[PDB]
Amino acid sequence: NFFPRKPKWDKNQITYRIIGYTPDLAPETVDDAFARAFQVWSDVTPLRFSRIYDGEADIMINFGRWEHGDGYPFDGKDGLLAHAFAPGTGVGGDSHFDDDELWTLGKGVGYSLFLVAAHAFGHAMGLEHSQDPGALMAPIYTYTKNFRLSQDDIKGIQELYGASPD
């Protein structure tokens, strides 16, 4: 359920910056997908995720293929879809998406940028894999048309950061 030594953010505002995009979707639809992915965690905690348009954000977001700047290379089609670093300084929290995947918001012909980002941002906030088959933090991708964060996910994220104020 957590990384070794339970790293977490020691603040409630987490900045993020989208360094670059995929050509597979419109940029405003990518922005919206990342926003919605953060909101699944915002909604049940006091966390807020603020977009910045320059400088060093807590979560630097980018797309790449194979070796893309951190010595944990992507792998072409399928397998590694995205990866995130546990909370911390430098690369901590950074979330990368493999552009050898076809990015979509639906089923079958690619991977949901929304669902993959929500899972990866769970890692960026300090959650490890769940063994609860219904949890977003369960390790195996699926497309869900009616996505609902599980009580397992809510329990983990609240254990680190507490519950929503409202």
């Binding site: 590694l80 879809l81 995205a82 990866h83 995130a84 430098g90 890692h123």
Partner: peptide, 7 residues
Amino acid sequence: XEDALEX
């Protein structure tokens, strides 16, 4: 696979 990294 290794989608959750430490550092």
